[PDB]
Amino acid sequence: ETHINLKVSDGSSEIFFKIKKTTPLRRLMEAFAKRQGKEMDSLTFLYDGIEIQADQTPEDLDMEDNDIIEAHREQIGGLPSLPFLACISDFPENHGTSRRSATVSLERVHELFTEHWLSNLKNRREKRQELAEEAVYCRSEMLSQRKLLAAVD
């Protein structure tokens, strides 16, 4: 009737909200951002493919009980391309690539990326709290890449 339950998710973590349909989503967005040490502008919330501004209300978007809002972090360097960079090898004239040779490569690529990310911290204007959550995000992603590479059948 007066309130609705919403689910904000970034694919890995979900949070539920109880808010009036007549109140601006600014509070909901800035709340979610806080739990990730992020600024509200550092993320992008979108409901049904469309983005949401800080003044639009659940009444505007005509949101319904138990609906979802997808939060999307801004891509981090070339993080998503790392495992692909490791798979590349010399043209097989005589030898053939090994699945172990790929994981060992991924180790080197994960190393290069890290050393570069850390070295890049001077150029970062973000706060400590926000860069910390990111470093942890990077490592969990890199870990996921490793598990996926070793899963190749």
């Binding site: 806080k34 739990r35 990730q36 040490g37 070339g78 998503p80 391309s81 495992p83 692909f84 960079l85 490791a86 798979c87 590349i88 090898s89 010399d90 043209f91 097989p92 004239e93 053939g96 690539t97 790929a102 060992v104 490569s105 180790e107 080197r108 690529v109 994960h110 190393e111 290069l112 990326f113 890290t114 050393e115 570069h116 850390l118 911290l121 001077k122 970062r124 400590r128 709290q129 860069l131 910390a132 959550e133 470093a135 942890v136 995000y137 490592r139 969990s140 890199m142 870990l143 490793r146 996926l148 590479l149 190749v152 059948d153």
Partner: protein, 421 residues
């Protein structure tokens, strides 16, 4: 510019042997407007060296980072050794790849069921070969891809990859013997991305791990206990209720987490309360027990290497002041004699481990006892890297509010516990 074809010589491998001269229809790219920078490069290109390779399976799974621009069948104007080039692609079950500055090329045969579907290769079959053009990758990335042979710091099969990543991130838990712990204790403010990532690391090693502000007393009793404080508690760690008990129970302490100062151990991993300790006395104590300094002197001798006694530089003038205040009509000849004893224990460097607080170290308070107790507290915050214990001898034990990490004991307590050794 009137040409509709991208024509080039194809060389392969470390021998750079000539496979042949090929053509690729780019007329579908001339109508577009977004890839002019790309097309100009394609045209001026007259030679393509295929030196790298990637399997089909890896492309299907990790190839989405590529941005497809155009795909089609290659045309052979001249065939020097294309047969061999085909055989190798088929045996390798993959595609030759070129990571250029202005574009990315994939070359594979029509026998490659995987890639024929992965890139919707349809239309005119000009030859057994097919090519796909993607947008170039960031310079930095291509560079890593070339240095992707071997890591500088090798991953060990016995360690969890989760810890190895932390290791690369300059948090080397193995260097501090963390993985021989009998209990892990993790503490942090919220939100706590690092703290709970750390919990994961140790839960993987099957080491008993607990996280939170409220830690049960029983968890400190293990043989080899590790206490990890997140950087977010670097200035409030003396609010942890369990701090002193932990020190008593021979726990090892570490600061961990990303820190930005300019904006064995590792950079984002730091020891706390390593060894030794600091001892100070309150005025209320110096009066209840005048002999204190010369009476705990022997303890300082033994611990001359890991311990120090620390008094404020104004300690003589401090006693005197509070001696007059307390006893306004007490004789003066007695005053000088009591003061000479302190001045003597400071003036004459009898002990090398008898230091004086720096003038800017003293925390001010109307009560001298509160002042000295607060100065030691501030000393723990600024010297947790040099000393483990911080003991304050004071007349009445429950007269001062406890400070986490400190031992506020009267002489008798100090006598039975610390001096018994």
């Amino acid at each position: 510019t009137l040409s509709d074809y991208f024509r080039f010589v194809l060389r392969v491998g470390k021998s750079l042997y000539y496979a042949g001269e090929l053509s690729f229809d780019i007329s579908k790219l001339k109508a577009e407007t977004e890839h002019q920078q790309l097309l100009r490069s394609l045209v001026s290109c007259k030679q393509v060296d295929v030196l790298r390779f990637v399997t089909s399976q890896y492309l299907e799974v990790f190839g989405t980072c590529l941005t497809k621009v155009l795909s089609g069948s290659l045309c052979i104007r001249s065939d020097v050794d294309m047969t061999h080039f085909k055989n190798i692609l088929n045996r390798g079950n993959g595609a030759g790849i070129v990571l250029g500055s202005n574009y990315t090329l994939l070359l594979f045969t029509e026998d490659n069921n995987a890639l024929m579907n992965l890139y919707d290769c349809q239309g005119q079959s000009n030859s057994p070969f097919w090519m796909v053009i993607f947008e170039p990758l960031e310079s930095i990335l291509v560079e890593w891809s070339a240095k992707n042979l071997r890591p500088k710091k090798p991953y060990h099969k016995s360690q969890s990859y989760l810890s190895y990543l932390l290791q690369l991130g300059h948090i080397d838990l193995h260097k501090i013997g963390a993985f021989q712990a009998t209990q892990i204790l993790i503490v942090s403010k919220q939100p706590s991305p690092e703290a709970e990532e750390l919990e994961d690391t140790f839960r993987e090693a099957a080491i008993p791990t607990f996280r939170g502000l409220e830690i049960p007393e029983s968890l400190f009793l293990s043989q080899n206990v590790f206490v990890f404080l997140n950087v977010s508690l670097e200035d409030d760690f003396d609010q942890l209720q369990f701090l002193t008990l932990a020190k008593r129970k021979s726990c090892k302490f570490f600061l961990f987490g990303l820190s930005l100062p300019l904006k064995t151990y590792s950079q984002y991993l730091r020891p706390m309360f390593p060894k030794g300790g600091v001892v100070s006395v309150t005025l209320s104590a110096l009066i209840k027990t005048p002999r204190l300094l010369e009476l705990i002197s022997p303890f300082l001798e033994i611990k001359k290497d890991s311990w120090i006694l620390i008094l404020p530089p104004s300690i003589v003038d401090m006693v005197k002041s509070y001696f007059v205040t307390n006893n306004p009509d007490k004789s003066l000849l007695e005053i000088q004699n009591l003061l000479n004893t302190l001045q003597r224990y400071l003036t004459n460097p009898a002990l090398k481990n008898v230091t004086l607080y720096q003038d800017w170290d003293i925390v001010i308070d109307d009560s001298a006892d509160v002042s000295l107790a607060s100065t030691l507290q501030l000393y723990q915050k600024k010297n947790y890297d040099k000393y483990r214990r911080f003991v304050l001898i004071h007349e009445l034990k429950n007269e001062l509010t406890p400070v986490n990490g400190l031992d506020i004991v009267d002489y008798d307590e100090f006598k039975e516990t610390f001096m018994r050794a």
